Amino acid sequence: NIDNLSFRKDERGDPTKIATHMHSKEGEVVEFVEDCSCDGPVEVWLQNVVDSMKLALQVEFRKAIPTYDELPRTKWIYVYSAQNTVVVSRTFFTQEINEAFDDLEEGNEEALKVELDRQVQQLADLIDEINKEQTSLDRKKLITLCTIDVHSRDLVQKLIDERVEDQMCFQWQSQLRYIQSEKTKTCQVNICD
Amino acid sequence: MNPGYPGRAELPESLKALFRPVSMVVPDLALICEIMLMAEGFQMSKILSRKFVILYKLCEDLLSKSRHYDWKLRAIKTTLYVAGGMKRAAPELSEDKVLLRALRDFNLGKLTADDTSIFMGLLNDLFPKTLELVPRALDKAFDEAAHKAATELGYQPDDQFLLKISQLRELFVVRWSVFLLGAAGCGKTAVWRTLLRAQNSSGEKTIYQAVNPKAVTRNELYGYLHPATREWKEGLMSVTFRNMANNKTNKHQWIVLDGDIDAEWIESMNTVMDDNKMLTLASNERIPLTPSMRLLLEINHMVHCSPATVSRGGVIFINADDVGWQPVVASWIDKLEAAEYRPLLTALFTKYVDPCLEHCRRNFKTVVPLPAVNQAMTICKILEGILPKETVRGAPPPDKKLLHYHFVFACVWAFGGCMLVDKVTDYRTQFSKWWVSEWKDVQFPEKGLVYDYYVDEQNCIMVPWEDRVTKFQYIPGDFTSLFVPTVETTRLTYFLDSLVSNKHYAMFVGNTGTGKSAIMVNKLRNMDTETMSFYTINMNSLSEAPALQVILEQPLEKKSGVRYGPPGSRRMVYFVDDMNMPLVDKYDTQSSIELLRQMVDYHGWYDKVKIQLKEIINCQMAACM
Amino acid sequence: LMTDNQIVKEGFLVYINDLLSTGYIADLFTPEDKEAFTNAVRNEVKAAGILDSAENCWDFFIDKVRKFLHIVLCFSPVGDKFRIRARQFPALVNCTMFDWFHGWPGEALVSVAQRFLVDVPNMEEVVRENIAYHMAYAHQCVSE
Amino acid sequence: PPEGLKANLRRAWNNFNEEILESCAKQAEFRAIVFALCYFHAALLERKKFGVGNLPGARSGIGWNMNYPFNTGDLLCCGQTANNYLENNVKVPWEDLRYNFGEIMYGGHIVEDYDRRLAMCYLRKYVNEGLLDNMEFFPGFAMPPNTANHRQVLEFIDEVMPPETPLAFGLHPNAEIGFKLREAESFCNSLVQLQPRESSGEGGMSAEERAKLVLDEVVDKLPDIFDMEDVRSKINPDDPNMPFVMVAIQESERMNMLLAEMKRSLLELDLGLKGDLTMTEPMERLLKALATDAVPGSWRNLAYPSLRPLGSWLGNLLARHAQLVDWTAELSTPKAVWLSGLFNPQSFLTAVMQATARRNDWPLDKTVIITEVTKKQPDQIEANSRDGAFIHGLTLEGARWDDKIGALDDSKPKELFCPMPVILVRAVTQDKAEMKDVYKCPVYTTEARFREEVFEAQLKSKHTEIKWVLAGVCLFLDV
To answer: Which of A121, B91, B489, D317 has a 20 to 30 A CA-CA distance from A107?
Structure first.
């Protein structure tokens, strides 16, 4: 994931060999948790800062769960990073689906309609900030979320036709789904077994 | 991957524990376009996709395909980009109406009229309320200055001129890689000429710089580190693109290129021809295109290119109505200003030009490819051949009679003058008789041959050219195979004499020694051979465009201008023995021939190495094959 | 005189091309050849009784070449490149006095057999000309 | 390899070890499924002895339209995951595995759904718990429910004999006639390559035949009256702005150029053989195509029956010309045409669909294809119209178009080749009735190649669609 590195200041001469955080692969800055110094024996602090990147992402995953008070708001879309907003949408919506069957109990259809409405209004504000002012990188975030939304509503219709066919059936089994064992801090993505 | 035939192919034999076959073969164009139209900010993009993706499947299945018709997802994406962008530039409407401006500016540029009918039908089957269809747009200043320029251009401002410049102007603000996909006689010249002159009349000054890509080797135009010296050779295109991409960011500029193409010298332009607009070079000069320069390519056919190649460039495919045979006729009408004859001549172009036109169209037919619009240019060349010897300032009846004679002659010599000659299937004199059966204002001689007939303009009698059986000579001198003209050569050389009186002339088609030498020496000896100076070259299948160009420039004085000029004041008439010897290239081009076309079109040249203009001052040609 | 056997490159016939189709070569003349050759020939024609402005030097130039060059061909058409090169340039048939060489006659057999069999021992004439016309016969049999 | 379902089957077993053939009867379904899938594999191979490429003959000689790559590695991987889930769960939810063993591991080397449905139906003919009770591969050779010891069933197929009925290979006994037709023409062209002659099919001249110039926006000419379905010509809700009129206009024009091309090439048959400025190498190479009696028509511009000699193929080529030079200009009327005379049959298909769309559906949506199955309730009768089109001579191969349904014709004379005589098809939007009563009939431009589908159809199948696709049926251009 590390395209480049992003530093604090000119500690130890050139900008701080303490790897404060990586530079995003697509071009952006993404923060670490612990910041280890480049000046040491290479591989060691390499391991350190890479693992810091990992731990940073997974703990901000942990953070984003209830701060998702409501949907990704114009607040929440931009307050939370691109990865934040998309990963939350992914796994949030996945457990929404896992509930949404009621596991072969009545109540799924209206729910499907509601999440399709989520797709509608979400795409709506995404398009709004495409038309209204938004940062080009945040517009890349916007189109990211649009392109999440399209598959989400695709799956909405997919399970509209696949009417009752749940995890006990093959069809929801087929779909992408995340056993969020973040009790262990893992997104145990568990498609067919 | 993707294999060749459904379900059967040619694959590795012993690689047998490493992969698992799955087939990802269905284009999801509806889904993807719907995605990008939410990216283009569209709400019924669901339904928009539902309609329009199938729309282009059906356009592919139905419309008369060509080299410049495609509905692959690439141009699909381009159209969606245009529609979304102008949608956010023209909000507050139904998404379909913006879609229809997109369609209107997109497909009408490339398609034909049958395609237009099919397109209207496909639209209104899905999209009723045709007031949607081709939604309203105004380019008032553009089209007024365009009609102005065309009138000033002499070309008839047939609002297909206005239509085409509308398309081009509205595409320039959309796409900078453009093609003027027309034809011979199309007056694409006139099209961009009206365009650029009118915009010069309205700011953002349109300085155009023409070149034929098939002039010299790709290296010289392109430029290169030398293959044996490793010095960077400057490239004409790259030099101009530094002069052009830079310091001409000031205002809207134009890079014109008349000719045609072949998939040999383009494959490296893939970083500036597209949106990338970034001329990366082998020596890495990295010349960036800016939105102050306009790329255009005045052309006829796409017989050598992949669709992905021309996908970057836009296609403005022209209708022949704006620069056509009757536009040629009325353009000449503009050119004549015989203040009293202008009321009289016009009807002749209907009672003579039209009937002789349909006669030549079906009543007789040829084996030599002839453009009828060039037959209009031919009759117009006869017109300025005969115009100075006409003065309507005198008595009107003799003037009108002599002019009626002139114009019926002009059909004879411009439409049977191009007809199949004798000795094939009875076409020449049969034309002549069936045409003099249609002379109306002035007496038509069914005696002998009107072919034979010069006409004593006063007394109105039709004198045979056998009055000019002279001259006669035959003797070995500083001798080779010998020639001498007689009657038909006298009439032919008088025709070319009236041509060169306007400095005009025509090319020549026919077998060797069919009078050729007699004709050339005849025209040489008639007047000051300093002026009537010639240059005979047989050009063969192996000597080609640079071998032609070197043998071009010996009489070419390079005097002020700088111009390829003749030595002193004279009018060279270069001779070509057989231009149809030179070989086509791998992409079927005898680039010597196209070099000649460049010579005659721009009336000048730039050396492959030099950056200097060498225009043409007074030259003529003599081209047999 | 030039032979297909002597022809190693058809570039040679390219350098014969403008001599015949055009009338004189520029195909092979190197630029120094054209320039200095023209300088010499112009002075020659000035000396040749033709003092002019221009272009009359090339006239006595045509004198000096075509009244003294008269190149002759000796090819066989079976190499079909014969007509191919003419298709590449008309000089091969432009002003070219074609001559049927022959096939090769039985009279050649007879008469050359008398021409050369004359010295062959034994001289015996009935036998030697029985031989001469037997060989005429046999050559015709071999041709058929 | 010595084949035969006994041989094929027991080394299909031997494609598995004992411990993964013979195992615990806890997973008795495991050994049952492995044995059923061994027979399944064996049967795929057996039918793979049939397919297309040199086929004017047996319909049962089509094991596969598009003959697909299978492998025993897939057999072993499916065996792995099956042992996985049957040691795991001796209980079986069918739809899961019936999607798995197909679409996600086997179906990837496939391009058409027809063979996918063929496999899933053929197995489901033997795949169920109701097919887990002494399952019949086909009568006379069954599945013994001793499904723990592989050695026991291995004995049982030491006692199963090789000679299986053709329908024990799930295919009617009509593979043989056209099968040896294939091998007959194989001997033919073999010995053809094995015997030299010079200038007899060249000595036989071939420039004796031509059609002439066709419409140039010149006429509206109408051979569009009767087919015994549309006994009289009809006009219905249509788009006469783009009816078949201009479609056939451009068809006739493009074929006019095509014929002019065959002319200007044929212009030099021996003129090429005796010209100097008029030698024609491509047709010089096609001179052998003339002589070798192979269609020199290679200027591929319309679909065509692929395997036909010059006489039949090119005479019927002229017949296609004739049929469509007649069927040039008919004022929007699309009825019984040969689907080969159409100089592009898909353009014709598009024309007829856009005609139906004003009638059989509404703007911004399209009708669906379904067939003429008789006995429709007498309320709102509208048949001889653009409710459907009319064709003649599409080969209804493997059944018979009798009682105006696909009638069983599979072991009966003229069953490899039945035609459609003629149909008024049905274009509708809600075709939601008679879907398993119908084989989903395709429409192809060929069977000798099965190169491409024109479109599909729903003909009333007299028997189960499972063995109906095991026999297969479709509609085509020609033989």
So the answer is: A121
Contact partners, residue B463, CB within 8 Å, separation at least 6: B453, B454, B455, B456
CA–CA gap between residue B364 and residue D3 (Å, rounded): 74
HEC secondary structure over chain D: CCCCHHHHHHHHHHCCCHHHHCCCHHHHHHHHHHHHHHHHHHHHHHHHCCCCCCCCCCCCCCCCCCCCCCCHHHHHHHHHHHHHHHHHCCCCCHHHHHHHHHHHCCHHHCCCHHHHHHHHHHHHCCCCCCCCCCCEEECCEECCCCCCCHHHHHHHHHCCCCCCCHHHHCCCCCHHHHHHHHHHHHHHHHHHHCCCCCCCCCCCCCCCCCCCCCCCCCCCCCCCCCCCCCCCCCCCCCCCCCCHHHHHHHHHHHHHHHHHHHHHHHCCCCCCCCCCCCCCHHHHHHHHHHHCCCCCCCCCCCCCCCCCCHHHHHHHHHHHHHHHHHCCCCCCCCCCEECCCCCCHHHHHHHHHHHHHHHHCCCCCCCEEECCCCCCCCCCCCCCCCCCCEEEEEECCCEEEECCEEEECCCCCCCCCCEEEEEECEEECCCCCCCCCEEEEEEECCCCCCCCEEEEEEEEECCCHHHHHHHCCCECCCC
Best to test chain A binding among D88, D92, D96, D97 (most A CBs inside 10 Å): D96
Q: Does C44 touch chain B (CB under 8 A)?
A: no
Burial annotation B472-499 (CB, 10 A radius, 16+ → b, else e): eeeeeebeeeebebeeebbbbbebbebb
CB-CB under 8 Å, B91 with A143: no
CA distance B302 to B367: 25
- Residue C90 to residue B481, Cβ atoms within 8 A: no
Identify the CA nearest to D297 among candidates D319, D253, D266, D269: D266
- Asked whether the beta carbons of residue B551 and residue C26 sit closer than 8 angstroms, the reply is yes
Terminal Cα-to-Cα distance of chain B (whole angstroms): 51
Is residue B526 within 8 Å of B497, Cβ to Cβ?
Answer: yes
B–C: how many Cβ contacts below 8 A? 55
Q: Do chains C and A touch (3 or more CB pairs under 8 A)?
A: no
Query: Which residues of chain B are within 8 Å of residue A156 when distances are taken between CB atoms?
Result: none
Residue contact A169–D95, C-beta within 8 A: yes
Say whether B536 and C90 touch across the interface (CB within 8 A): no
Tokens found for residue B108: 């009408």
On whether any CB of chain D is under 8 Å from the CB of B518, the answer is: no
Residue with tokens 């006729």: B329
CA-based nearest residue to B389, from B332, B458, B325? B458
Beta-carbon separation of A127 and B43 below 8 A = yes
Spatial neighbors of B461 by CB under 8 A, at least 6 apart, are B455
Residue ranges of the alpha helices (H) in B42-136? 45-62, 73-89, 95-110, 113-126
Place of tokens 């994931």: A1
Q: Do C90 and B543 touch (CB under 8 A)?
A: no
Beta bridge partners of D142: D136
CB contact under 8 A, D93 and A168: yes
* Secondary structure letter of residue A164 according to DSSP: S
Which chains does chain D touch, 3 or more C-beta pairs < 8 A? A, B
CB D396 within 8 A of CB D473: yes
What is the nearest CA distance from D27 to chain A, expressed in angstroms?
A: 20
- Partnered with residue D428 across adjacent β-strands are D368
Residues of chain B contacting A143 with CB distance shorter than 8 Å:
39
Q: Please name the member of A131, A147, A149 whose beta carbon is closest to the beta carbon of B41.
A: A131
Task: Indicate which technique resolved this structure.
Answer: cryo-EM
**What span, in angstroms and rounded, lies between the C-alpha atoms of D39 and D342?**
45
β partners of residue B605: B614
